[PDB]
Symmetry: D2
Subunit: 394 residues, 4 copies
């Protein structure tokens, strides 16, 4: 059982040899699902480097199931080292594109260097990879749109949420007097008013944060007050939208619109890194379960709706082309993030601040094209006949 695993890894295993093989699977020693095992190893090093069969069983037994899949290469991407080397090549290629313009409309976005570039990957199995500046905090901005949508649907269900907001691209209101979808400001503002009704903003914010925290496997989620204050002061177009929505009676009964706008600016100001965000995207890749905690964050219904709208509406005006050429659900944001989901496989956050004319981060856009150019991840690729493409699940 745990003995079997011992043999696949002589009389006694040096600990470092166990750790090194574990880290090659793509797992991180700090994985919450590995905690018992790692605690035991560290404790063992104290009271003791070689592990005999009996010691190994002792350290590895609590986590044995997860550990067996790792070593039996049952993970979604079994040769991860090979895959990450491709990710790096693609990272390097995109890094040669200097074009684009960093958003200057508020001091917090403008300060960011155009030359910051990073990519983080988290598979639905919890395998992690990062290259570039992946520990630098930035604001989600519109990348928050699908997440608060997912929350709303999780709590209120499809039918209700979509009384208030549309299901498709625009190509302020559709024929039915609703904003076109959750990924446009008008739609996001309305989705924001749907969450945790009848409570003050402080608890609403906290409530939302609980969700993000879980989606991120308790990795970094933070808040930029500097950005919130600036968004709120320069927010004229969003105020125009708010008054219009109120005038057309688009909000739930009793809504305080100005309060909702404040909440909305707050939500846009939430901070992540590529690493933590990649976990959020992996939760969406994993059907609502956080890949690194095994926790159930969101209903399958919420995740399906959200991925559908990211595919359709997620890239601003580039959505149609992105869907045709990339065919992956994604959400761009003005700070230069692109939240990417390859369903059943992994999730990513790509970050470079310079934007193209559509509003999309130039290196992210270029990286996403290459990713699908290389691998058979396009939504409508086939898993049997893919031509020259590479399939990393094999």
């Amino acid at each position: 059982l745990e003995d079997l695993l011992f043999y696949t890894i002589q009389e006694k295993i040096p600990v470092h040899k166990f750790i090194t093989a574990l880290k090659s699977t793509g797992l991180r020693t700090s994985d919450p699902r590995l905690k018992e095992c790692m605690d035991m190893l560290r404790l063992t090093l104290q009271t003791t480097v070689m592990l005999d069969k009996d010691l190994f069983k002792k350290c590895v037994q609590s986590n044995i199931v997860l550990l067996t899949q790792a070593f039996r290469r049952k993970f979604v991407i079994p040769d991860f080292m090979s895959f990450t080397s491709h990710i790096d090549e693609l990272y390097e290629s995109a890094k040669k594109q200097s074009g684009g313009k960093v958003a200057d409309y508020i001091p917090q976005l403008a300060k960011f260097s155009p030359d910051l570039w990073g990519v983080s990957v988290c598979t639905v199995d919890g395998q992690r990879h990062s290259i570039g500046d992946t520990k630098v905090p930035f604001c989600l901005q519109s990348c928050v749109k699908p997440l608060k949508y997912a929350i709303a649907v999780n709590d209120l269900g499809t039918e209700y949420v979509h009384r208030y907001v549309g299901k498709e691209p625009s190509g302020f209101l559709n024929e039915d007097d609703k904003p076109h979808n959750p990924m446009v400001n008008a739609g996001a503002i309305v989705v924001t008013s749907l969450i945790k009704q009848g409570v003050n903003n402080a608890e609403k914010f906290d409530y939302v944060m609980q969700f993000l925290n879980k989606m991120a496997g308790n990795e970094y989620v933070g808040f930029s007050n500097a950005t919130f204050q600036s968004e709120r002061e320069s927010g004229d177009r969003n105020f125009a939208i708010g008054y219009y929505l109120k005038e057309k009676k688009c909000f739930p009964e009793g809504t305080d619109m100005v309060g909702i706008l404040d909440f909305y600016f707050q939500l846009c100001s939430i901070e992540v890194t590529c690493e933590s965000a990649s976990v959020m995207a992996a939760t969406l890749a994993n059907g609502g379960f956080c890949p690194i905690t095994g926790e159930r964050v969101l209903s399958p219904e919420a995740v399906r709706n959200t991925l559908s709208l990211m595919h359709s509406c997620g890239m601003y005006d580039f959505s149609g082309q992105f869907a045709f050429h990339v065919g992956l659900p994604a959400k761009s944001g003005v700070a230069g993030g692109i939240l990417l989901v390859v369903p059943n496989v992994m999730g990513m956050m790509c970050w470079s601040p310079p934007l193209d004319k559509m509003g999309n981060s130039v290196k992210g856009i270029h990286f996403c094209h290459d990713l699908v150019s290389l691998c058979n991840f396009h939504n409508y690729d086939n898993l049997r006949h893919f031509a020259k493409k590479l399939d990393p699940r094999r």
Copy 2:
């Protein structure tokens, strides 16, 4: 290998015993890939020797089959569900037939990417593809000329005659389908063009029923005012490739719309698309992966007319409707389908078709954005 299979099924196997067990896997005794085997049986209780002699040539396929390795391992179960969904849509009596056909005609056909087949309803009655051909001829065009060339002439996304670039919005609208028609087999006459497409559709269908309705073609082309208006407009905006005869393309276009299929043959067509360009019952490579992926993308967003976005959100499967009441349905990596009932809703889609498609995804985890690990209460037919 033929030995193992033999034991799996006493000293001798009655022929019928092997036949009914084979049928139970979803395959038909007439599968083109089973020909050698069925010929060997026609040349004769099989003892081990006669059995090995008969099945040796088809062994690999038969092995996949009897070892429950097909994309849907328990097909008899999956079939029973298709039947319930069918009987449920059958009770929906609404819609309006376009204008000769009888309402109450309803049929559904399935072909898995492994060539497993099922049918219920009026499944052998030939009807016209109409706009169902749109993705088919777009696939042919991308197959021969590639993505970059074809999309010089036509858009890649939905609308809401020409887009901001002076191209028709996509291949699934009439304007776009007319332009696409002008791209195929350029410079050759219409007669050869029609033969070429007809040959291409034969491959897609694994050589099952494909036909032409001259009656439909005649009336279509007399009533084609809106399409004529479109042709003159496209010509004037210089939308066609140099040297196009637009009045001739419209002819060809009306012809392509009049091509006939049954639910059964058209389901194989959809199966080719679900199989990455390989025909499931012939094993023949038909379209390039590039052509198939483009086609599925545009059917997903553009395929259902004004109901496209609603259909993508709820059903999440590439599909293409036509005014005869066909819906060409693709579940990638799993199966193709054709649903046929003539009565249409206000949007132009078959009423029973639409109902069936919703229920199918309500039941099974086939939605494009369903997860294959956590699906809640949905059935997964692949298990």
Copy 3:
């Protein structure tokens, strides 16, 4: 000259006869241009060649035009009898919208003021109501008068239909355009001063007849302003205002402007000023430049009636502007201004009775902008004896 007029009107004239003959021409004895004559007559009960010349001397040229039938509409009594029929005819049309309770009957009134100062009224013409959108052409004329055509039209469009190709509101007659126009006027001072200034201007337009302000309407508009705040934030976002504009304050000024009150009678003089080329008919004072008055009439023509503007231009062919209080400011260039007021509105937002009356006026008279003055077929021409 005074003698000429004297004989025209025995040894002595009874003075009730001069008054009666005067009123007969359409002028009122309260006409600001007749004051001296009326004061001299107050000092004086029969008028001999001598007393008559004394009373009438000051104003003689105006009274001569009046008695010699030189006025734009020489036979006025006949023309007002027609206005009355049209009035009764439109009166009988009771459709429109303002479990509604009703404590009192419907209000309907029509006032006519000619470019010569001839006046007529029937119905409820003394009851104050808010201009609302009727104020739009008025404040646009002010802006153009003060700033000129080039400057105003950097901020707003000249054509019918939030923003057009150039990211300007379409014209001065739509809310977005009227909000921008509001921001153009008196940019130096504070809001109280801007309001006084506009109010003074409307006094000139009206020959100092009734104009006022309704605080109730103003507060009600303030509370209901979501639609107008949406527009106000959008305009700001798109940088549609002149530099240093306080947009929230401009809307407040906007609501005040919509809340200004008039009567059918005083508003008809406002319209007669626009019909008279910028000169107030009853004071002879020059209120607005010709450029401001031409620009205003042109935009009233195409843009003045909401979504009925096109149909109205084609069938009626007169510059007009309507508002939700039920008013229709009507202009007939070179002839007269009018104000029609009934509160019930049709589905397009225009006063039911007002619209009916405007149609009938042009069916009857050759006032349609594209009518011909030589060959009019069946129509009546009131400019002729």
Copy 4:
């Protein structure tokens, strides 16, 4: 009256040339159809052998009314020589502006520019190339609509076509107005229904002849064959109209297009077309024949729609700045109407990026900058402008 007139012109006897020179200075042409008997007697009188009171009476008696108004300065523009002198200056000023493109290009001669005036009293003036024939093209649009309304009335015509400024169709699934191609095709299908194109065409041609006081109206077959070849977009419209059921019952659409191209290919000069516009300014009566041609409601409707819809995409700006009903065409013509005063035709082929003749447009602005002709100018108070009626 004949004696009164004789005295104002007179001395014991009037030299013939002196009566003629005075007549011309009023703006009337000697060839005026309404002056025919007068001129006939005059020529007859020179044969049988200086006018005395009795001889002068004999000559002008049949035409006395019109001649009396002319000499008494009762014409809409009493000082006509002063006015034409202004027209000439505006013409020269429009000339120095050579921008625009005619519908690497070679040039075999100078570009043509001409301006004709016909007053509602039949006073004439021309300067520039005013006798050169050119195709009406879209300038024919208000003319054929006026015919439709004349024969069919407002209700019938506007059951098929919109009344407002402006896809091919409005919310009623009717073309937006008579001045856009789709609307003008539908109007074309209204006229003289149930006869062959040859008969319909002769019918419009005689109508055009009356509007023009029987001055030049013609046809360009070269232009027609060309329109017929390049009409892909008009055939697109034709099939769309047909698809949407915009034509009256039983119309042959392909035949209707053919009639339409014909109507576009009709030819005028600046002079003949100025009389056409003057008919529209005169309430349906032709100024030089005194003949009733179009009904008042047809003339009103046409002027209304020219005002708002006449200049293509410049209609909005044109109405605002110029305030005159006008219609322009791809040949470089602008048919202009000052209601109650005059008609005009301006012709220069080079077009601006909107499709309007550059010289015509420039001339129209200057005309209104100078004169109080703007639809919304006041007649009593106008500022620096001059009023030619005074």
